[PDB]
Amino acid sequence: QISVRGLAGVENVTELKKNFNRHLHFTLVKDRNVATPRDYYFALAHTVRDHLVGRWIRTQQHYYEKDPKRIYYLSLEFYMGRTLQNTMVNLALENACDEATYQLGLDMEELEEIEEDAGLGNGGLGRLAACFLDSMATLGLAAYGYGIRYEFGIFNQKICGGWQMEEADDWLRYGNPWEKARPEFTLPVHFYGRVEHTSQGAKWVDTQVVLAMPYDTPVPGYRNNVVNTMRLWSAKAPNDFNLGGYIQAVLDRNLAENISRVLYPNDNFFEGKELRLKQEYFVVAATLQDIIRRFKSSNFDAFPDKVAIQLNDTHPSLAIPELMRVLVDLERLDWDKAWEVTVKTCAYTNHTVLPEALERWPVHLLETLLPRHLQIIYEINQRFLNRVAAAFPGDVDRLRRMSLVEEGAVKRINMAHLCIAGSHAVNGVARIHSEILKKTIFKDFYELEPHKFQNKTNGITPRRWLVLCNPGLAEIIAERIGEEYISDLDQLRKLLSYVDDEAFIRDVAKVKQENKLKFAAYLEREYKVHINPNSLFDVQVKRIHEYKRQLLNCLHVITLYNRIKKEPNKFVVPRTVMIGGKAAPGYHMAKMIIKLITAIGDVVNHDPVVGDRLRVIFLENYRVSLAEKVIPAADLSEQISTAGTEASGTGNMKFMLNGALTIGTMDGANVEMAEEAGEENFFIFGMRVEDVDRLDQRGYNAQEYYDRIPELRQIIEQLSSGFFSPKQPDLFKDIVNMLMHHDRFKVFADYEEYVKCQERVSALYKNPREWTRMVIRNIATSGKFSSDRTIAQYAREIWGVEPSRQRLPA
Amino acid sequence: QISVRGLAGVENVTELKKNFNRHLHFTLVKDRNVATPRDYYFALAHTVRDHLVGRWIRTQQHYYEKDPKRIYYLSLEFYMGRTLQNTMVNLALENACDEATYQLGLDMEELEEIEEDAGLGNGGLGRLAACFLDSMATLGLAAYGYGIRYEFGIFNQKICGGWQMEEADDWLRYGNPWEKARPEFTLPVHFYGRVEHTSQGAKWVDTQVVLAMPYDTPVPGYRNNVVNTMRLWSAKAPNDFNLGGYIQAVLDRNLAENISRVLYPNDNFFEGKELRLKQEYFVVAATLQDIIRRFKSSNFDAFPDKVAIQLNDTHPSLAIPELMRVLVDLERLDWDKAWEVTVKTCAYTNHTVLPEALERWPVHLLETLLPRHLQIIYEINQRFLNRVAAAFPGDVDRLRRMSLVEEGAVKRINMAHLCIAGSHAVNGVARIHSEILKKTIFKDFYELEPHKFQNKTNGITPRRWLVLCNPGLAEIIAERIGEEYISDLDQLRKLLSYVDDEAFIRDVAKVKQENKLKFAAYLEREYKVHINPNSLFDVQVKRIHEYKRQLLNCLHVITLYNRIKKEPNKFVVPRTVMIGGKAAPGYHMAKMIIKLITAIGDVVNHDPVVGDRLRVIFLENYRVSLAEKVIPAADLSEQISTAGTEASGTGNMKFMLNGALTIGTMDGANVEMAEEAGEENFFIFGMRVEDVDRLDQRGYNAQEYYDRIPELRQIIEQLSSGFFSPKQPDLFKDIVNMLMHHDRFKVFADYEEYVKCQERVSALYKNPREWTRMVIRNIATSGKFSSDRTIAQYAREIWGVEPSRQRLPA
Ligand SMILES: O=C(/C=C/c1ccc(-c2ccccc2)cc1)N[C@@H]1O[C@H](CO)[C@@H](O)[C@H](O)[C@H]1O
Ligand SMILES: O=C(/C=C/c1ccc(-c2ccccc2)cc1)N[C@@H]1O[C@H](CO)[C@@H](O)[C@H](O)[C@H]1O
């Protein structure tokens, strides 16, 4: 049908058809009288997977022969979503499979909806890891992603009575056709025990053993025949473990296997729980044995020429002392040589500045669980502080500020300090964030070792986030400029020379309109909710946090409703305001915010005076597959974190590539997006970081804003008095109380400017031609935000390897 | 190579070769530079499995069209062993696969050794269920086996320092290529809760839900293209289950899933544990919903014309009140109609007379776990006792003896009484056992309803237990009489006309000798133990229990050793005495017996005066795959249970078919085996049941035997004084104490007769020609003990269906 979806050759279609039927018969053990749509999904997935395996085997054989430097990307999260369509896109099989399935009497899009998301992440950090694997394969890098195969990923969110309920994401129930278990590469991981000192060094003894069993998933590059590996570890008990007496010993195997059972869902709070520490060590210990095994199967001097380890946040920070443990205790290298190798091998990426998100593990936990690692960490700390003392003699406060060990009620290890000390490179994830790291939280470290600190601005993969989710847009672009932009996104700049082309203008606008009609239909079908597709689609989707300021959005919504009720017969640009995202199960304020959003909906959506001029919908169970549907349909992207709090953002980039305009603060990557597009083509408002700092020095007093802005006061009274919760008038007192007396994120301070900026958005939307021309200018300048650019910078400036765009042979 | 292994056609071999390579590449994702023998095993298994699926689908389609009466065989145990070779045998593929693998440079026998046993049973009862599925498929019956998919089967036994150690049988670690998960047929099972009475009957409410997920395994008939199904249920938690708070609720899913985690290993003790009761209900509740679903998908009057349920012991006895619950509570049939349907549908097989093996569940357990079932059981009991009262008025002791409810300290339900009341047929498993049921333990029930009581003498499948494990023997037989005996074992009688044929005599003896050389080699390779293959192979393999009298065997062994030490230069027929079997983890005396056997070995095997005239070996980890190796190699089968204690035995039959002579008591099926072969061709000794009864009336006094038999006294002194345990002289005091003062199984009373009978065995073994002629007479009369005869009798006399030997089309 559409050109970017590839060829539908007679030979190809015929062969796909017979392989589909083979799998249905031999693999699924069904015939067509009993097969359900789920059976048909699986037959398709196995058919497509078969096309991967030859390339997968020859890619890994290629790396064995050429022995390139290998990149190991360590992450506790890989937020992959669905795999079927992505695989078809990257292998150029989408149209052939569409034809083959059509001829079998089946609708491929319907089969695609059956696949479960691989929801092995919380949000931004997890999805970045996924985008990165796609780009590393596409750029021909010999890269491996290593993590944990959680039996249960991020919980499925149900809304009951306006409240979030969590249920288990049993994503493996029907089986996962993409993974291959590799029980033959199982490895032991040690916990607890104690340290003995001998003449021939330290020995870690009397440990409990848990086994790490790997499962490999293929990661295909875009049409280059490269297929890389994501290896996820699963926890297994040894067979003499514990060995009711007998029955109970068998049942207690669960204790060990609980390590890989569930993803921690609390993504900007740190909870120092033992089970999470076990997960962190488990991934690190198994991965490093795997790395070393592969290195020996080609003298540790050359280890950093053959190995790069990238730490995604501090979550795998124990790689540093584990590498030291292996090198010193097992391989018998002297300390200084081992340290040199470790530093040259490891690099650390930081993803936040909020102090409550930093990992600080209690010493008593490490002491019991990982006694040898604690000793190594103390030794690292001592030698590190000796260097600080020599560089800044007499500066005793610097010594206590830079220490890896934090003193206090409970002593803790600062894992961020450990990562800086033991890495040759440290990067933030957007320019403003990387500057903040150097100026504030890691200032002392930057003065000691300025050469370590870098920026690598985040990106997204244009395969999933344009070709896959928005084929209509990818096609009209391809018509004008060809297909090469899909792996070289900077070529979208050529679209500037069509900003005055009346045909293109009409087509960009038509694609958006079709995407919106499609999504409005999805809403009615799967959620019995009825929206006006001529309204402006105003969308804020991301995890629920106070710093992301969903509450500021809420205040605007209520202002609109109040203005309509005041002058009901005045014209306003109609809006559908959509907000979605998950709240961490323990985060009370985030749960109250969800309830507020649904409560506003209850009032606004049933007020006959409003009509269909304003609708407020809470988008349930936001996740990767829902993002792929809502983002192509959006007109306005809400990116409104308090300046200095969102390290980068990546949702922002998705919306820009897909033809929405952005209203946002000068925070994270928003700054670079506005710089690329031009500030005239962005709806920027609010305090900059400098303004927030000045307000903090003075003291933030929310009462001042309440006293001087009558529209704001009216909303606060409505919240307080039970306007949005008639049967429980005090339901939202916690929210009011927070806003009035302890708002760390200064919601009121940006209110006026935000409401004014929103009026300008509405004004532009009334002129469809100029809206669409501004959109073209955004899409055209979105090229910098491809993850291929990001990974190319990691490769050259951190890992010391050259990317390659050349096909491997098929 | 050998004819019974089928054709090796050029077309077949070529096609197997390419399918093997396909699976290695696409299924296992390997190439031949990295493949291990385990990879090659899996490629073979998938290749053979492909040949099943077409027949499996068309068999089940055939049953849908013809709608025959369906047989449901309910068992908590299915002791299947390995599947690969059995599948090849039954499909006539063994020689083709042997050729195909040879041409690929691989040894098929070596690949066969990689497969794990499916050890989902303890011993006799579990293996009977397995033999039965094979025979039901071979006889064209529309039969389904239903049980539990235990994650851990019977423990692997290691011997450390002469002691049994148990380790977990993690049989699914590498995956099971034979099963197909069917998550789409998942069913809810209810526990706990309470009963509400309404106007419209009782309702069971506030229950906890566990999900039952089925896994289907194919059961192929012998060369008839029938493939039946064994459906095993796996326990899964629902996704709102419980829903740390969040983390802990996810981890607590283990509680529900523990139902299918592990097989109870205690096979002639009853332990009233809650987890076992959950297993019993779980299998019954899921199975019955499945049965009813299938019945509706063609008025419950016709239910018993379309459904037979066979209860393998009392373990699935809750089928009776569950069927009543469904019919009365959910389908709204009146009680009397429901009861009629239930009785006509269910039949019960009893497997023992030992009182400590009978299931008697505490009322308080049923009360909490299954409150509605308890009510139904009380109601059944009340109506049943009203019938007893009417038939035997005034007989008040009969009323208390026959009651399903046992009074006492704790009230219990007698599940055997429940099964008799609710079944139209009750059978024992050998003639003597079935007579004992009528005369003693179920006398009262037989007087009330004599028509219910039947005999069905056990059997074994000649596919696994001759063709598969002893191809050499199957071939020399086939040469003389053709192949038809494999599915009509009575044809072995034709071998009587070769008892004087000198060629046949030499061939029978040569096959035994080759089997023995092969096993002696297996011993050295896998266990560093060196035996003389010219000795008589004296074998006792079965679970370790006092009633099976491994101790009597021990006493004989020590007598032989003592006679040699007394007259060392006298000639004796050399022996290798092999004893093997698992002890239940809690059964202290059984564990002491294993230690005694190894201790005797320690002394006997290293005494230079004995030389290689006597060896005592404990066969470690006895299980189905080990039986297949040792049984073909045996000369003498030890079947020496105290008369009246072994209900049937089936090991006995295996040895008879494979060319060993039997020394045994007149117990279980030994009686019928001697009757078939002729008592002159059997080494019978010891008390009969009548003699045991007379001794009990008088009072068994072991001291009398010790006082009158000097050779026995010497052994007891040796045990007592530390002869077999020098460093711990009192190690075996418990054993001596038991033998002298509370031996329920009268070991001393059969000692003299046993030792004398053993001398006659030795005398015959000195004349190789006459030994072999007696063997021929055993093999020739083993036909009655085919499980095809057994199942044909169940089919006609219990289930009301005709067996069929006709091929389905391929
Ligand atoms: O998603 C995250 C952080 C997730 C996270 C997840 C888990 C944990 C955690 C740590 C310890 C124990 C339990 C949970 C801590 C943090 N950060 C986002 O990373 C994106 C990619 O760089 C940025 O675009 C966002 O600005 C940043 O907030
Ligand atoms: O194997 C068994 C009994 C096994 C068994 C297994 C499990 C349990 C059990 C029951 C409740 C709770 C836990 C365990 C009770 C008994 N019996 C043998 O059955 C054979 C087949 O009929 C006969 O040949 C043997 O004579 C008989 O002992």
Curated annotation (Swiss-Prot), chains A, B:
> Out of the domains of life, which is the source?
Eukaryota
> What PROSITE patterns is this protein classified in?
PHOSPHORYLASE (PS00102)
Q: Which residues carry this modification: Phosphotyrosine?
A: Y192, Y215, Y446
User: What CDD domains does this protein's entry cite?
Assistant: GT35_Glycogen_Phosphorylase
Biological-process GO terms, alphabetical: glycogen catabolic process
Which residues does the record give as AMP binding sites? D31, Y64, R293, R294, F295, K296, S297, S298
Molecular function terms from GO: glycogen phosphorylase activity; nucleotide binding; pyridoxal phosphate binding
One Gene Ontology CC term in the entry: skeletal muscle myofibril
Please give the residue positions where the record annotates the modification N6-(pyridoxal phosphate)lysine: K654
Quote the record's activity regulation.
Allosterically regulated through the non-covalent binding of metabolites, being activated by AMP and inhibited by ATP, ADP, and glucose-6-phosphate. The activity is also controlled by post-translational modifications including phosphorylation.
- Cofactor(s), by name: pyridoxal 5'-phosphate
**Keyword NAD in annotation:** no
Q: Which UniProt keywords apply?
A: Acetylation, Allosteric enzyme, Carbohydrate metabolism, Glycogen metabolism, Glycosyltransferase, Nucleotide-binding, Phosphoprotein, Pyridoxal phosphate, Transferase
- Site Involved in the association of subunits: give positions: C97, C131
Q: Which post-translational modifications are recorded for this protein?
A: Phosphorylation of Ser-3 converts phosphorylase B (unphosphorylated) to phosphorylase A.
- Spell out the NCBIfam families in the cross-references: P_ylase (TIGR02093)
Q: What is the stated purpose of this protein?
A: Allosteric enzyme that catalyzes the rate-limiting step in glycogen catabolism, the phosphorolytic cleavage of glycogen to produce glucose-1-phosphate, and plays a central role in maintaining cellular and organismal glucose homeostasis.
This chain belongs to the protein called Glycogen phosphorylase, muscle form
Q: Which gene encodes it?
A: PYGM
